[PDB]
Scaffold this active site. Structure first.
Site, mmCIF file in Angstrom:
data_model
loop_
_atom_site.group_PDB
_atom_site.id
_atom_site.type_symbol
_atom_site.label_atom_id
_atom_site.label_comp_id
_atom_site.label_asym_id
_atom_site.label_seq_id
_atom_site.Cartn_x
_atom_site.Cartn_y
_atom_site.Cartn_z
ATOM 1 N N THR C 1 28.135 -58.725 34.557
ATOM 2 C CA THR C 1 27.721 -57.297 34.530
ATOM 3 C C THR C 1 28.612 -56.463 35.436
ATOM 4 N N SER C 2 29.154 -55.372 34.888
ATOM 5 C CA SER C 2 30.020 -54.411 35.616
ATOM 6 C C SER C 2 30.256 -53.144 34.770
ATOM 7 C CB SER C 2 31.366 -55.042 35.990
ATOM 8 O OG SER C 2 31.229 -55.920 37.084
ATOM 9 N N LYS C 33 29.092 -53.838 25.748
ATOM 10 C CA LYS C 33 28.130 -53.322 26.718
ATOM 11 C C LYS C 33 27.923 -51.811 26.619
ATOM 12 C CE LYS C 33 28.419 -55.646 30.696
ATOM 13 N NZ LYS C 33 28.046 -56.777 31.608
ATOM 14 N N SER C 129 26.374 -56.256 38.104
ATOM 15 C CA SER C 129 26.635 -57.382 38.981
ATOM 16 C C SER C 129 27.760 -57.191 40.030
ATOM 17 C CB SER C 129 26.903 -58.599 38.105
ATOM 18 O OG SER C 129 27.310 -59.710 38.873
#
Ligand SMILES: [Mg+2]
Ligand SMILES: [Mg+2]
Ligand SMILES: [Mg+2]
Ligand SMILES: [Mg+2]
Ligand SMILES: [Mg+2]
Ligand SMILES: [Mg+2]
Ligand SMILES: [Mg+2]
Lengths: 238, 240, 196, 204, 198, 233, 222, 222
Positions: C1-2, C33, C129
């Protein structure tokens, strides 16, 4: 009287319902293009105190489906809403945008259900749905208050039905195909106005009418200005 | 012809006509869409000297930007307002942005709608005028018992609607560019007086409100006080 | 996740990785995403998979329904819709979700609906993340609004370093250009950002 | 803390050339204490057979529930329930209660009165179907049964031999399982006739 | 747990059931009958959770008696026990199960033969020649396996049982305060009240 | 049940001869993180009230909505809405409290510590706490969570009791309340430097003095400290 | 997890004087090791010459009182402003209190007033409902420091007539209100001295056949 | 539990082994992890067996009802959306991961849904215990545009990967193929690598070895 069989099984509330659809007093016609579709409806604005923007008998249900209705404005706005949301709920629940022919089914379905179970009086309006889906292309299906739909290669709703009709019918026995040969919508539009003017023994200015066009997935209502320019177009060429 | 749901031999709902018939019978109400914002006015009828003035308000605000008035059956009006009040405040909580006048009408139209569908319920006995602002300008509509409503340049119902009608007619042409925010009020002030001449033997009290980004500042405020007075006097001179 | 979204002169553009991890393993190293709710309204999902996915679906529905009656909706009008969903269910939901959209009038707006449901209109936001190391860069190397290409780099390097120190986030880069022009679908292959 | 393992019992079935077989032990008891040696885990609904292992009350309740339904089927359809059909049913039935599962291990087997084809099935407590062409085992000593069956099953035995095989399969695995025994019974299903036999075994 | 025994013989059935009642430490009553006659020829001893016990019994009792006057015809031990098991079967998966075990003794008049059904709280039924819920079996089951014969007279049974008791006393930790014994036969029910002086 | 996500730290307040004060920095923390350097923790209601919220921002934002939404609701059919009949601080709070309680009584609260301040139409001072548990109390001084342990002390040196309010000048109040604000920043990890103070005086009215810095700090002496016991050079 | 309860110290006290009644209880309010307000009343008049107080957890407390003061009001509406005999009020409270049996009001509550004869009367409550007609009860944190004392002073417990050997216990005698309040103040001071959760001030409501009187006396801000 | 799916230039193919475990025991040597949702849309599913089946049964059941009513044809994402809306409505409590794949009147399609509601898409997806071996195989031998032959060859050789290096999977191979214009062929056991060798001795017993105590001829019909 009331909603349960006559002696010859024809419960008139459904029948009566019809006159009222008509009673409004406006004429709606529709025809298929080749990569577009079109509907004509009159826009008679009496009271000089209103605002033509707020008037119309055609609304944008979906990104690609439009609807016209020869019938009393209160009841229409209702049908408009429910339908408008059935499609909304559909795309969500199923992954793909709902086509013309189908909406008209739950729609007729709905009006049937009402009618049989008695949970309300039928709406006195005839809905004429239009669009073009990539399964059957130029689609045109109509529905009445007696909960029932079917298909039209081009149709009409109004006080003067069969007149608008017969013309097209004759124009069809000759053109022999089951639609309008032509590439541009502007051009088709021209064609219908044409076939209507001729059909009423009447002429229209740039506000006396109301028309819509269904394209390759991008339905839009014809506005005041663009509307006039087609009259320009079809003036000399006549 | 006696039940609410039913249709006549050629498609007609009589209960709704009578609904209309009662709407006319009551006091007269009006409204006008001007430069930016709107202006409303009604006809409170002083039946005796035992009525506290500046008191029983017939006009009501919705949210903090929508003017609203009507005529016919007073409790019916009040009732309808409440529903409109929820719908608004619910929407607001949901979308954050204050409710678009365009849709608002429907929310109400849809509710007045229903009361024409079942026999166990009674048709709404009032014609309602209202408007407000937003991003894309000010609007003004007028809802009837049938539930059918529209957008007008100015509206009118109750007893003498024609008076104000032909009166509203004029304004259109001489000021085909929207009447001044200010003049709008004082003009409304007059249009009422003229239309009152039926309850002429019986005195009355005029009530006025308005909306405007320039005057009210996006809001709906009650025209009371100083502007209120002159607006009357203004009417009082032309009253000859 | 980013993930993240940044505003500038022609509007705003949001970008994120492709890496999604179940434990120390890579489920699908090629994730989209970035998600579309409306034509000029999109969002980048953070945190829980299954949850974020479904939220969107619902929202997409509300809006695509809003329009059919109340015209085209704002960017703020959109955030509030997530506010509700996120809030009400804070107990069975894990979502960092960042929202962004543009309107000619108010330019493009950026709102972050972090965990809990708290909403925020910032110049630009960043969640996911590996957001934890670009609090240094981002803030420091941030000029008030830039150019189309000028901005594309903030995105580019912010995203680059996040891969360099956070395994749970990686893969390719993907941007979505929301402007007056329209939507533009970007993609910056590996050997690029690493070089920098 | 396992329910299935409280009462005891096993059931096994095999398919022969033109017939089938199904047998079970007889023991029933709360953990250590043995209680009955006349408790049968095999019944039928007309020409269809069902063996059920697992938790005792749940077993009984099931039999009742099935006798019930098959009676009602055969009635409106003027014909007895078919094997393959039954399977699909008992399957769904188990699932309807997927969140308050019945702790059992059924096994169906029979002969289809139209095709004349032998049939056998097994399921987990929620209705997952295990279609097999050789043998089915369920119950406490599941693992011991697979050890026997894997050695002894021979594609297409004569009914008289199949009996001897299955008997020995059951019988022997039962002795290495502490919670099953106290007698057993084997049925042999032919197109028409059917033979029920009780066998002699260790009573410990 | 408590003591619940039962043994089917020639043309009758016999039910034993301890008399004591305990509340953690002290012993309240010690002359308590854990019985409840369902119908003229059916009877049921029970042991279980403190409240669960006496409620359930009476409730079952109610239904039966109801059925029996409604129909005017009496219900068979077989069918009776079937219904009890039904009720417990549901009970077990109810929001709150009645934790109770039972023995049901009756004389089936049509068959002119005595039947005895043991049933635990899980809804587990079985016709038996004799039985005992709880720990009660461990101490006795052997002696029964040993001496029991289907043909035994009513008296023969008592002696046996009497012996089982003497044992339960000898090796059981708990003091059950003795036992109440009862017989179901073609004549109905009577109590061997004499088991105090005997 | 639930758990707090973003966190507002303290909110200090006190009364004086004319009116009352209430300050609260603009930081919304995400655990040990400071993901939000400028966030509003003071909702003024009407023009005779303000509400210093301390706890969960997600929850705090909800309340805001309840206020604006309650406010717009008072208007509705009532002309005197800007004078005679209009929200007093005592009201809001009463309603607020009501809510916080139902909530805990429904096993699902709002993670918040709240102060209501303002002045009554008839001129009286109002200052009252109310937290997620539905607990409340009046006092010459009031501080949320972190405040009360460290702020209240100093605030009590200005007003040890109710018998000092009459003689508590609006300026003496301020500076002191700010010295407190400097201290809160001197020893509290959850605190920020930027903030928002507001005054409600029965004479002047509401004075939302938004965004300020904490100035004048003795740090120089830092240079003199070396090691922790032996480390000389 | 979430803990829905809390303790705010406090100590209250009720003595049933021959023809009067007192309900005293300090003004401090606490949390952990901190202070909340030097002054915060826990004792109230609820009309009909009846005083109340509920100590333990503020919120549950004041809610009960509020919930009660309303239930008094409503009693008048349905019975033509009939006065609520104290005995009645209590039976009523029992219910209120018991309403929340499986999620109680975390508080010891007490009321005091006069019976249908003019005799003083106090009533002590359980946190769920059991009520007793007490003639003297201390509840709250300090409870165990004052109760032993009143035991002695108010009932002359363990006190005999000198020279009687230990065969004649000292006879009880009824003390005037003045006499009682002296005891009461002493009780609280002693308590404040040795109890941290107690100090600051003391507010006393005195019930008599013509109203409610309030007198305050400051304690130590230890 | 070991499955994959890979779409080529004119369609898509999914394959799965035939072994079903049960802790360390092999329950079914021949099971079909490949189920039919509709003629052109099929699934392969791992994790909890009874869940995976019943669920497709359900969905297949509805989608049929749909197409009929709509008079059109089954779209792939219709199935997907149906699955994951219900699938997640039961927040995880229904362990079923799967590779949904088929072809609709608008293209070839392939997706993967997790047990919680997560859905993905790529050109090739693997779900199961041996999802890693068969992943590693496809992550070295994959190139855009493969043919009915190239793709097939691969899919089956990926499955093979799990069958060997991973315990939880074995026996034969199951395959199904959907082509953008053509039908769908179900190839139960395209392969048969694992086959038990002929046993050593003949274990058939000599008639009459088993001791019998009783016997009879049970009843059937009325
Ligand atoms: Mg009706
Ligand atoms: Mg990385
Ligand atoms: Mg097993
Ligand atoms: Mg054994
Ligand atoms: Mg009384
Ligand atoms: Mg101290
Ligand atoms: Mg392997």
């Amino acid at each position: 009287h009331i909603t349960i069989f006559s002696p010859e099984g024809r419960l008139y509330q459904v029948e009566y319902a019809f006159k009222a659809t008509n009673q409004t007093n406006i004429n709606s016609l529709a025809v298929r293009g080749k990569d577009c579709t079109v509907v004509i409806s009159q826009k008679k604005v009496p009271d000089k105190l209103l605002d033509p923007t707020t008037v119309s008998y055609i609304f944008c249900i979906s990104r690609t489906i439009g609807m016209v209705v020869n019938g009393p404005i209160p009841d229409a706005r209702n049908a408009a809403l429910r339908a408008k949301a059935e499609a909304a709920e559909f795309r969500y629940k199923y992954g793909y945008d709902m086509p013309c022919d189908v909406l008209a089914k739950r729609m007729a379905n709905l009006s049937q259900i009402y009618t049989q179970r008695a949970y309300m009086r039928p709406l006195g309006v005839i809905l004429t749905f239009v669009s073009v889906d990539e399964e059957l292309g130029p689609s045109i299906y109509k529905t009445d208050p007696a909960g029932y739909y079917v298909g039209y290669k081009a149709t009409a709703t109004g006080p003067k039905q069969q007149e608008i009709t017969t013309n097209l019918e004759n124009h069809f026995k000759k053109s022999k195909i089951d639609h309008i040969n032509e590439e541009s919508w502007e051009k088709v539009v021209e064609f219908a106005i044409t076939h209507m003017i001729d059909a009423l023994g009447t002429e229209f200015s740039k506000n006396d009418l109301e028309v819509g066009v269904a394209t390759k997935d991008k339905f839009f209502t014809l506005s005041a200005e663009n509307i006039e320019e087609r009259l320009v177009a079809i003036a000399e060429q006549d | 012809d006696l039940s609410n749901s039913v249709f006549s031999p050629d498609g007609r709902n009589f209960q709704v006509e009578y609904a209309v018939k009662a709407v006319e019978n009551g006091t007269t109400s009006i409204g006008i869409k001007c430069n930016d914002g709107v202006v409303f006015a009604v006809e409170k009828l002083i039946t005796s000297k035992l009525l506290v003035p500046q008191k029983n308000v017939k006009i009501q605000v919705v949210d903090r930007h929508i003017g609203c008035v009507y005529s016919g059956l007073i409790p019916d009006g009040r009732h309808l307002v409440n529903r409109g009040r929820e719908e608004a405040a619910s929407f607001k909580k949901l979308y954050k942005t204050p409710i678009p006048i365009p849709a608002f009408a429907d929310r109400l139209g849809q509710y007045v709608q229903a009361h024409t569908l079942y026999n166990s319920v009674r048709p709404f006995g009032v014609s309602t005028i209202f408007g407000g602002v937003d991003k894309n300008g000010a609007h003004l509509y007028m809802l009837e018992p049938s539930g059918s409503y529209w957008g007008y340049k100015g509206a009118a119902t109750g007893k003498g609607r024609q008076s104000a009608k032909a009166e509203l007619e004029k304004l259109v042409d001489h000021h085909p560019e929207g009447l001044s925010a200010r003049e709008a009020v004082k003009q409304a002030a007059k249009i009422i007086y003229l239309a009152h001449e039926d309850n002429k033997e019986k005195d009355f009290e005029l009530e006025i409100s308005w909306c405007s980004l320039s005057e009210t500042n996006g809001l709906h405020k009650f025209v009371k006080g100083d502007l209120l007075q002159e607006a009357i006097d203004f009417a009082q001179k032309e009253i000859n | 996740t980013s993930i993240m979204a940044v505003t500038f002169k022609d509007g705003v553009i949001l970008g994120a990785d492709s890496r999604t991890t179940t434990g120390a393993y890579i489920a699908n190293r090629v994730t989209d995403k970035l998600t579309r709710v409306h034509d000029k309204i999109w969002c980048c999902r953070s945190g829980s998979a299954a949850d974020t996915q479904a939220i969107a679906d619902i929202v997409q529905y509300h809006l695509e329904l809003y329009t059919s009656q109340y015209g085209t909706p704002s960017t703020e009008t959109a955030a509030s819709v997530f506010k509700e969903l996120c809030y009400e269910n804070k107990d069975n939901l894990t979502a960092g979700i960042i929202v962004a959209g543009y309107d000619d009038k108010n330019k493009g707006e950026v709102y972050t609906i972090p965990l809990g449901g708290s909403v925020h209109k910032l110049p630009y936001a960043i969640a996911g993340s590996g957001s934890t190391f670009i609090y240094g860069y981002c803030d420091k190397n941030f000029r008030e609004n830039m150019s189309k290409e000028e901005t594309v780099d903030f995105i580019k390097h912010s995203l680059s370093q996040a891969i360099k120190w956070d395994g749970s986030s990686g893969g390719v880069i993907r941007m979505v250009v929301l402007t007056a022009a329209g939507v533009e679908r970007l993609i910056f292959y590996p050997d690029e950002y690493e070089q920098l | 803390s396992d329910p299935s393992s409280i009462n005891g019992g096993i059931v096994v079935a095999m398919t022969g050339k033109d017939c089938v077989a199904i047998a079970c032990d007889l023991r029933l008891g709360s953990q250590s204490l043995g209680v009955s040696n006349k408790f049968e885990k095999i019944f039928h609904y007309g020409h269809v057979f069902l063996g059920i292992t697992g938790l005792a009350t749940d077993v009984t309740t099931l039999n009742e529930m099935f006798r019930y339904k098959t009676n009602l089927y055969k009635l409106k359809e003027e014909r007895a329930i078919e094997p393959e059909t039954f399977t699909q049913l008992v399957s769904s039935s188990l699932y309807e209660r997927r969140f308050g599962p019945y702790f059992v291990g059924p096994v169906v087997a029979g002969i289809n009165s139209k095709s004349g084809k032998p049939f056998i099935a097994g399921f987990d407590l929620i209705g997952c179907i295990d279609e097999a062409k050789d043998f089915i085992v369920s119950g406490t000593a599941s693992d011991q049964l697979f050890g026997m069956c894997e050695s002894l099953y021979e594609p297409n035995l004569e009914p008289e031999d199949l009996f001897e095989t299955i008997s020995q399969a059951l019988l022997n695995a039962a002795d290495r399982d502490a919670l099953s025994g106290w007698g057993a019974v084997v049925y042999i299903i032919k197109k028409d006739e059917v033979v029920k036999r009780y066998l002699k075994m260790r009573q410990d | 747990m408590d003591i619940i025994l039962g043994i089917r013989v020639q043309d009758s059935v016999i039910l034993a059931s301890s008399k004591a009642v305990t509340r953690g430490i002290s012993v309240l009553k010690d002359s308590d009958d854990k019985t409840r006659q369902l119908s003229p020829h059916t009877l049921m001893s029970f042991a279980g959770e403190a409240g669960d016990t006496v409620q359930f019994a009476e409730y079952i009792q109610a239904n039966i008696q109801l059925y029996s006057i409604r129909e005017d015809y009496e219900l068979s031990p077989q069918a009776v026990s079937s219904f009890v098991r039904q009720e417990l079967a549901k009970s077990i998966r109810s929001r709150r199960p009645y934790q109770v075990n039972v023995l049901i003794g009756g004389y089936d008049k049509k068959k002119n033969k005595p039947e005895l059904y043991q049933i635990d709280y899980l809804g587990t039924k079985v016709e038996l020649p004799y039985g005992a819920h709880g720990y009660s079996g461990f101490y006795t089951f052997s002696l029964l396996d040993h001496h029991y014969r289907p043909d035994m007279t009513t008296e023969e049974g008592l002696d046996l049982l009497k012996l089982c008791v003497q044992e339960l006393e000898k090796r059981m930790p708990m003091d059950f305060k003795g036992v109440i014994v009862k017989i179901v036969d073609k004549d109905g029910i009577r109590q061997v009240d004499d088991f105090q002086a005997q | 049940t639930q758990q707090p996500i973003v966190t507002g730290t303290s909110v200090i307040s006190m009364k004086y001869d004319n009116g009352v004060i209430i300050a609260a920095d603009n930081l919304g923390s995400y655990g040990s993180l400071l993901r939000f350097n400028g966030v509003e923790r003071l909702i003024p209601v009407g023009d005779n009230t303000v509400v210093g919220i301390s706890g969960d921002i997600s929850d705090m934002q909800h309340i805001e909505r309840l206020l604006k939404d309650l406010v717009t609701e008072n208007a509705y059919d009532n002309p005197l809405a800007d004078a005679e009949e209009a929200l007093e601080p005592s009201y809001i709070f009463e309603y607020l409290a009501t809510v916080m309680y139902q909530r805990r009584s429904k096993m699902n609260p709002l993670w918040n510590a709240i102060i209501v301040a303002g002045v009554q139409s008839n001129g009286d001072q109002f200052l009252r706490y109310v937290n997620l548990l539905g607990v409340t109390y009046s006092s010459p001084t009031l501080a949320t969570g972190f405040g009360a342990h460290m702020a209240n002390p100093l605030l009590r040196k200005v007003v040890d009791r109710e018998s000092d309010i009459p003689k508590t000048t609006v300026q003496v109040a301020e500076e002191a309340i700010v010295n407190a604000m400097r201290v809160l920043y001197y020893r509290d990890a959850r605190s920020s430097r930027n903030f928002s103070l507001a005054i409600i005086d029965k004479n002047t009215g509401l004075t939302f003095k938004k965004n300020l810095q904490v100035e004048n700090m003795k740090w120089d002496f830092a240079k003199d400290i070396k090691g922790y016991g032996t480390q000389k050079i | 997890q979430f803990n829905p309860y809390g303790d705010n110290g406090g100590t209250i006290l009720g003595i049933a004087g021959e023809d009067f009644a007192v309900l005293a209880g300090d003004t401090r309010n606490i949390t952990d090791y901190s202070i909340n307000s030097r002054y915060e009343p826990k004792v109230f008049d609820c009309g009909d010459n009846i005083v109340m107080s509920a100590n333990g957890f503020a919120a549950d407390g004041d809610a009960l009182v509020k919930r009660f003061k309303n239930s008094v009001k409503w009693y008048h509406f349905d019975h033509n402003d009939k006065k609520l005999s104290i005995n009645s009020a209590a039976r009523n409270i029992q219910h209120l209190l018991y309403g929340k049996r499986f999620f109680p009001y975390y508080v010891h509550t007490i009321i005091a007033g006069l019976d249908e004869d003019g005799k003083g009367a106090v009533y002590s409550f359980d946190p769920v409902g059991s009520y007793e007609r007490e003639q003297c009860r201390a509840g709250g944190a300090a409870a165990s420091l004052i109760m032993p004392f009143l035991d002695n002073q108010v009932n002359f417990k363990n006190q005999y007539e000198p020279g009687t050997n230990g065969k004649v216990k000292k006879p009880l005698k009824y003390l005037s209100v003045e006499e009682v309040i002296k005891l009461v103040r002493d009780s609280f001071t002693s308590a404040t001295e040795r109890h941290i959760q107690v100090g600051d001030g003391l507010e006393i409501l005195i019930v008599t056949k013509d109203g409610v009187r309030k007198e305050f006396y400051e304690l130590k801000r230890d | 539990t070991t499955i994959v799916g890979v779409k080529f230039n004119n369609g898509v193919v999914i394959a799965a082994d035939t072994r079903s475990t049960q802790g360390p025991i092999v329950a079914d040597k021949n099971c079909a992890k490949l189920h039919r949702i509709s003629p052109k849309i099929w699934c392969a599913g791992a994790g909890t067996a009874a869940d995976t089946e019943a669920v497709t049964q359900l969905i297949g059941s509805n989608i049929e009802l749909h197409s009929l009513y709509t008079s059109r044809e089954p779209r792939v994402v219709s199935a997907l959306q149906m699955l994951k809306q219900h699938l997640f409505k039961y927040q995880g409590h229904i362990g079923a991961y799967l590779i949904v794949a088929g072809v609709d009147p608008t293209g070839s399609h392939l997706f993967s849904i997790h047990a919680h509601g997560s859905t993905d898409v790529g050109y090739y997806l693997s779900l199961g215990s041996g999802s890693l071996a068969a992943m590693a195989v496809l992550e070295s031998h994959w190139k855009q545009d493969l043919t009915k032959e190239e793709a097939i060859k691969l899919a089956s050789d990926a499955i093979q990967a799990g069958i060997w290096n991973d315990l939880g999977s074995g026996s034969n191979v199951d395959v199904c193929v959907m082509e953008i214009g053509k039908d769908a062929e179900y190839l139960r056991n395209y392969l048969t690598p694992n086959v038990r060798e002929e046993k050593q001795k003949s274990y058939k017993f000599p008639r009459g070895t088993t001791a019998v105590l009783k016997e009879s001829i049970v009843n059937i019909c009325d």
